[PDB]
Amino acid sequence: ADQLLDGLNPQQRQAVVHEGSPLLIVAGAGSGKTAVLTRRIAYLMAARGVGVGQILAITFTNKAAAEMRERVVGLVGEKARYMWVSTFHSTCVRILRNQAALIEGLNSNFSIYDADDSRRLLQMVGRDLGLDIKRYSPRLLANAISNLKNELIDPHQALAGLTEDSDDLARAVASVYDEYQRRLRAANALDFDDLIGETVAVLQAFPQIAQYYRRRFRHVLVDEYQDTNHAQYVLVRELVGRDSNDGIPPGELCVVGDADQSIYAFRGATIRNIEDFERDYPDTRTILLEQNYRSTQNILSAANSVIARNAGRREKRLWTDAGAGELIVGYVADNEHDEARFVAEEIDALAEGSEITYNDVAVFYRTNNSSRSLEEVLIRAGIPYKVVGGVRFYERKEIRDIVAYLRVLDNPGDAVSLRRILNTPRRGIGDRAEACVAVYAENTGVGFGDALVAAAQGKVPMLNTRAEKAIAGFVEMFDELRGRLDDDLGELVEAVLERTGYRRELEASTDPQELARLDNLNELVSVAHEFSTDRENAAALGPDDEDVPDTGVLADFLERVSLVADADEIPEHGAGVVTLMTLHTAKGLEFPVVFVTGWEDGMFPHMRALDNPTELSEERRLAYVGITRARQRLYVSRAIVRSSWGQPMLNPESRFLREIPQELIDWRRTAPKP
DNA sequence: GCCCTGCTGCCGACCAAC
DNA sequence: GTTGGTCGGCAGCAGGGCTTTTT
Structure with a gap:
């Protein structure tokens, strides 16, 4: 454990494992690893008998947490997995389940x-x-x-x-x-900002949660502190600055990142945060690190060109030991579709022999010409194609519907699904889910909200006093609610499927897009039960896996059943398939080898930022981060002609490209004739 | 190039009162 | 007996309407 604690740069030192001394990295390379990764962070976090209730980290979407889990389990071997780096919301919810209704009347089951x-x-x-x-x-x-x-x-x-x-x-x-x-x-609905505000409020007002968050969390992991919002910085200063004994500087410090990597201001990222950090963190130990031991000298030259080329960039110089390999090879094309054709052909010629097959090599684009182009040239190549946030996923319904039924199972407070269909002309159409949903008490003398809400053919005379618009409302969810409030989850979901016949309304009924919904709810039942392969969610994948159930508190069960968003399975070595994904899905992901189809003056410089100056700086720093998050081999390309839906727009090779030396932005080594 | 999307809507019992 | 308005569904139907990005 103590045999690999010196040798190279402090970059991954103050990123991964075991040493002392305070922390504020002014970002350099983060490349050297041998003892580097081994020598700061877990020892920093555990230096003062600091545990899970005393440790917290920062994630907006936990993909960055998953990536650091992967890095630690790979080059370290486990440490991160059991240690408390999930999100603010983990500890926030685990203690709000006890002391949430005490603040603003927001019960521990806050929506x-x-x-x-x-x-x-x-x-x-x-x-x-x-x-x-x-x-x-x-x-x-x-x-x-x-x-x-x-x-x-x-x-x-x-x-x-x-x-x-x-x-x-x-x-x-x-x-x-x-x-x-x-x-x-x-x-009583909350979000990330609402959760952090409630946490701050239950610190100030409520004593023991203050002594827990503010004082226990004297050790905190902070990565990419540039995007830390003012509320986020206030919270973290509470956790670290407001130690058990006030008047001393903030607790042991672990903050890293690059401030002038502000790319998500239009997502909400703060710009500088350095001097903002320093005055409420007098323990600020800036580490001007500039070494490098696995990235190349060509990446070094590009980084040192862009470190001063970008005006809104705190010029943190960098130096690299490894030779000048992998000049950033582009490809100028007169058509985006032809560009994707050439890029996919070169990928097929170089990789799909025995290495790089299906997942990581991806193209992030905002003009959707690359969308049709890349998928079409991948299918033409015969290899599959992967799309995560490309096209044809917004004006297509039934995903909102399936998540709506999931939420109705969680909370029946959904009325837009009822608004989708309209019952009676000018009586139960566009009014019965807009007026009475407010007052199920006195909209029209309503005795019961679901009383006159029942088909007059299959009527329920016992309750037909007054209801939505005194006519209608298509009783569709009240039966599900009264079923849910009566039985256990398994027979509940099966009864919703068949007893109510709604999944039978999906299977037997076929005129609308129904059979796809039957498949979707079969998948839902599979998710509620054990269906994932070779991977188990804690001690209970499904909510009913009582083989060894843990955390009887409803919070963990609800989050583990309701945070089903996306996944990817084929491993890193299999990267050949061009993944068609947006920058807002890979906010914290890096890849070894990438072709970038269409890096041109007008697209990667955001179309919004083409005229937006603050977002122009944001996307200049976005080019910075996209360049610097690579490891050894990053490549680009150009697509002059881009035919958008409204009108086609054209670009030459980007200004960000020519900002870097033209030799550095190559277009002739790894993009030859395929 | 669907596309939200309310408007049409037209049966079908209400529902009692006649 | 005796029946027509008005309480009730899920779907046709045109009817302008649409960045890329949209935290």
Whole structure:
């Protein structure tokens, strides 16, 4: 354990395993590993008898956590897996299950809004107040609402901003924020910003949770601190600065990243955070590290060119020992489809012999010409194609529907699924899920919310006093709710499938897109039971796996059944299939060898950022991060002609390219005739 | 090039009162 | 006996309508 603790750079030292001394990396390479990885972090975290209730890390989406798990189990052999790096929400929920209803009346079963719920939020904000679907863009309305939640401010301030701070922009943002805050109070819905705000509130107001979070978490893992929001920095300063004995500097420090890698400001990332870190963290030990031991000298030259080429870049110089290999080879093409053809042909000629087969080599694009091009040339090549956030996945329904039924199983507070179908002209159509959903008490003298909500043919005279619009509502979920409130999960789901006949409404009925839904709910039942292969979720994959059940608290079961988002299985060595994925799915993922089809002046410089100056700097730093997160062999290409849906747009080789020396941005070594 | 998507909508018992 | 409005579904039907990115 103590035989591999010196030799090279501090880069992966203050990233992986075992040493002392405080931490603030001014990012260099992160390449050298031999004893490097072995020599800072677990020892830093455990230096003061610091355990899981005393350790916390930062993840927005836990893909970065999974990647560091992989790195540690590979080059270290296990340490990270049992150690507490999952998310804020892990500890937040595990202690809010005990002390959540004590703050703002938000019971320990506080609900959480989601991405499809976010889209329906945009729609209902546009169509709820005196607004339209696009007058004030509800997308940016919710974005500013989240920004306000991070800043932890009431809508009243920006409402009074009329003639004080603004005239209609901030006033309207505060208006929609007030409407959504009333909705939150009526619904007890939370999100990441709401969770961190509740955590801060239960620190300040509630004593023992303060002594737990603020003082126990004197050791915290921080990676890529650039995106740390002000609420996030306030929380982390609470956990570290507000030690058990105040007046001393913040607890033992573990913060890494690169501040001028701000690429997600339009996602919500803060810009500098360095001097913001330093004054509330007097223990700030900046480590100006510039060595390198596995990345190449060509990557070094590109990094040192872009470290000063980017004006909004804290010029942290870097030096590399390894030779100048893998000049960044591009490929200029006069068509995106032809570009993808050439790139896939070269990939087939170079890799699919015995190595690099199916997963990692990917192209991140924002003009969807690469979408059709790459998949089409992969199928033409005969190799499969992988798409994670490409095309044909937004205007296609039934995924919102399946997650809607899952949420209804979790919480029957879904009414847009009922709004989808409309029962009676001007009586139970577009009104019975818009008016009475508010007041199931006095909309029309409603005695029971589901009373007149029953087909008059198959009527229930016992309860037909008054209901939604005193006519209708298509009783579809009340039977499921009363079934759920009565039986155990297995017979519940089976009864929803067959007794209520809804999965029989999917299987037997065929006129709508129903059989696909039958398959989807068969998959749902498989998920609720043991169906995954060679991998088990803790001691109980499905919610009913009582072979050795753990954590009878409903929180862990609910999260492990409700966080089914995406997956990937074919291993790293099998990277040949060009994955068609967006930058917002790979926010924390790196790949060894990549072809980038179409790096050109107008696309990777964001079309939005083509005219947006702050986002122009954001995407310049995005080019920076995409370049610097590679390891040995990163390559690009150019596609001059890009035919978008509206009108085709064209670019030459990008300004970010020519910023790097043209020899460094090659286009002739690893892109020859295939 | 579907596409949300409310409007049409047209039967089908309500429901009692006639 | 005696029946027509009005309480009730899931689906046709056109009807303008649409960046890329949309935390």
